[PDB]
Design a protein around this ligand. Structure first.
Ligand SMILES: NC(=[NH2+])NCCC[C@H](N)C(=O)O
Ligand SMILES: NC(=[NH2+])NCCC[C@H](N)C(=O)O
Lengths: 436, 430
């Protein structure tokens, strides 16, 4: 409790918030490239995401350390694989933040065309970017509530259709466009896993924010599973709903499919509603990531595995100097990217960020078995089945990324292990030292 | 000493053998795609390889554990990063052996066209493949000698030209093709590093076979550095020598540039010589890898980190059952072929991972023993780092992707096979 921690509801909405985020609005546009067979892809993507949820759920229950993934990998494998998880996820976070502010603010252009011009867009972003760094400095009680309101604002259309969308949905349109890809059923299913497997990055959120959730052992597991269950429901119900409402042809070339789901549904400026709700979604998610950025660095900084400045806190215990760095960085790697100008662009270096997150997922399912075997009782086979699913889920994600971004993920992994060696020799503690 | 270990010379020739191997004959054909500016690429590729040599040299001096890379990673980072190194490098080895038998036997087609036909080629390979598995079962004293002879047989042409090739050398020729790539100087340099940086895979050999080298602490470092020095000398002297001997135009479309080179000096039957020496090279290297395969699995098996069967030895101490597995596997993933290289490629990135964790291990374990040469050892190992990273920077993406995916599967198997036995730096209470 004591005192400014965050409760169950905010925490869980932070999970749903970060998960659904920017993408929930573009899904039916990308599945439309393959068809209604994307339903099968979901059934596979869901049980795979429920696996990784349960893993994080049980893990955080057993050890509710602050920093989630990072924490477990330190217990399991030592300071090095700890240091690796942080650096990766910490980047995966604040690069992820950058994507939110862009996408979010970009929805607002529907209201202010003023900001399609790329320069003004970047000025607006610094502003809104620092707005949320500041909200994060007034503390996790505060941003979790701003996100909680943001994300329920963002759920309005997504339930609206998910629930009321059926009233107009039919078979004729949905089924006609069952398999537009022109690939075999298993071919298609894989081509939808390319999209949908990245839909549940975010499941870690609660377990990472353990240090700031009120009753970690009860709540982190509830927020973890619950969050993922909200996301699943929406995804499935909403994008199957849209594929029986708008014809495939129109839908796959749509910039905002929910905006179009509107212009017939409630018509007129109902796109207004959706582009506000869409913008609210991201901006909420924005702040939620920058939070999590704040926490990993904190945890790692606290065990000597990240610079001391990230461990420095104000009296409430929130890492102010830590967040101001994330804030500065995002301001640097944002001016750098004024629509070309300096060089090129660049959604590569956000894509590599998304593989950085799958590495922690992997070391966590390892950590569950390697640390947790003691506490499994007679449910041993259950926990083996589940985590191997979580494994298949992480590998099968990378199996169908682009090469280019895995290559680069891998290169940054090498450079991470070059810095550890260079920065920690002397302080390092060897399982089997040499004598002097 | 006691008793059937291997001495300095065989060890070091195993190093040079495995390094130069199949590639030393194809180098000047691939550098001919860019020109005599590949000389600059070499100067960068050399000091980078002398780094990673020195690293392995000092590491194996300090700890001369059997398994080299694997050993060090276990000390440094624990059983998991140990397990990771072995599985990788063990695959790196026996996939690498498959490549050698193919290439090696393929040179012999110059004598027996009978075996360009792809079926007969694979039958031949199983035969020769199991010839060397057997030679390896009669022990490391034996294969190291077969390799030593194989690799000095393979050095004939390579010194022949490297030394005597200068008599047909022509500055005009060499210069006129200075930069055929049509890229900027730094562009060209990078386009030659693509080839040359993979030239020194093998530096690990001696430190990996520490369990079988006579006086490990003196010899593994000598064989390590010495080996790499022999490879550098040849590479540089021989391929610059050829580029002033044969015009760029001819040279870059050559199937065997040494065959063409040699036909200028000895002439006529020089192709026979070269295709025998070229085949001797690979087949020697073939056995030397299957050796190293034998040793990692042994070392890991011995620490519970690989199946017990790989730790099982005959009275001489050599892992017979272990090698028969490698032998079977190579027989399976060979008949699997017919008709009906990526894999050989992914295997090559697998070897750069151990290199990395070794330079780490040098600093993380060795800092105690650096005395007042601290800066020297930091400078050197950071080169060794740049060398490993810069290799991967210019691989194909497809084979890094797959190297990475196999890394994930490796860590899923550790979790699945070692939970209960695993020892956590910071456990939970029950
Ligand atoms: N445009 C992007 N790829 N943004 C990355 C955000 C990832 C986050 N899991 C989401 O789906 O909302
Ligand atoms: N074990 C391996 N992956 N070997 C690949 C061959 C590399 C070696 N430098 C050669 O060209 O001969």
């Amino acid at each position: 409790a004591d005192a400014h921690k965050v409760g169950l509801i905010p925490v869980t909405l932070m999970v749903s918030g970060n998960i659904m985020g920017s993408g929930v609005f573009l899904l039916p546009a990308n599945l439309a490239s393959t068809g209604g067979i994307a339903i099968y892809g979901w059934l596979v993507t869901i049980i795979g995401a429920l696996g990784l949820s349960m893993v994080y759920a049980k893990m955080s229950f057993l050890d509710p350390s602050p920093g989630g993934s990072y924490a477990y990998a330190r217990r399991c494998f030592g300071p090095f694989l700890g240091y690796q998880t942080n650096v990766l996820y910490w980047l995966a976070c604040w690069i992820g933040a950058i994507a939110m502010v862009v996408i979010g603010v970009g929805y607002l252009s529907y209201f202010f065309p003023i900001l399609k011009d790329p320069l003004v867009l970047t000025i607006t972003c610094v502003v809104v970017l620092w707005i949320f760094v500041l909200l994060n400095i007034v503390g996790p009680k505060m941003i979790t509530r701003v996100q909680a309101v943001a994300t329920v604002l963002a759920l309005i259309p997504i339930v609206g259709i998910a629930v009321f969308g059926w009233f107009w949905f039919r078979g004729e349109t949905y089924m006609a466009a069952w398999n537009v890809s022109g690939l075999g059923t298993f071919g298609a299913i894989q081509s939808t896993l390319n999209v949908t497997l990245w839909s549940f990055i975010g499941v870690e959120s609660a377990s990472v924010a353990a240090g700031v959730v009120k009753n970690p052992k009860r709540n982190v597991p509830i927020a973890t599973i619950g969050g993922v269950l909200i996301a699943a429901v929406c995804y499935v119900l909403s994008t199957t709903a849209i594929m029986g409402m708008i014809p495939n042809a129109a839908l796959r070339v749509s910039a905002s499919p929910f905006g179009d789901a509107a212009r017939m549904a409630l018509g007129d400026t109902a796109g207004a509603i959706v582009s506000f709700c869409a913008a609210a979604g991201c901006l909420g998610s924005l702040g939620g990531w920058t939070l999590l950025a704040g926490q990993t660095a904190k945890a790692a900084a606290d065990d000597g595995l990240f610079p001391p400045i990230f461990a420095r806190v104000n009296k409430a215990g929130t890492p102010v100097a830590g967040l101001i760095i994330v804030g500065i960085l995002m301001t640097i790697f944002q001016l750098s990217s004024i629509s070309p100008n300096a060089t090129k662009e660049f959604g590569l270096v956000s894509s590599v960020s998304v593989i950085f997150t799958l590495v922690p997922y992997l070391y966590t399912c390892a950590a569950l078995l390697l640390l947790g075997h003691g506490h499994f009782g007679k449910a041993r086979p259950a926990y083996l089945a589940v985590t191997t699913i979580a494994f298949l889920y992480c590998i099968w994600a990378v199996v169908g990324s682009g090469a280019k971004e895995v290559m680069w993920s891998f290169v940054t992994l090498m450079v991470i292990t070059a810095m550890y060696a260079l920065n920690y020799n002397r302080l390092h503690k060897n399982p089997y030292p040499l004598d002097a």
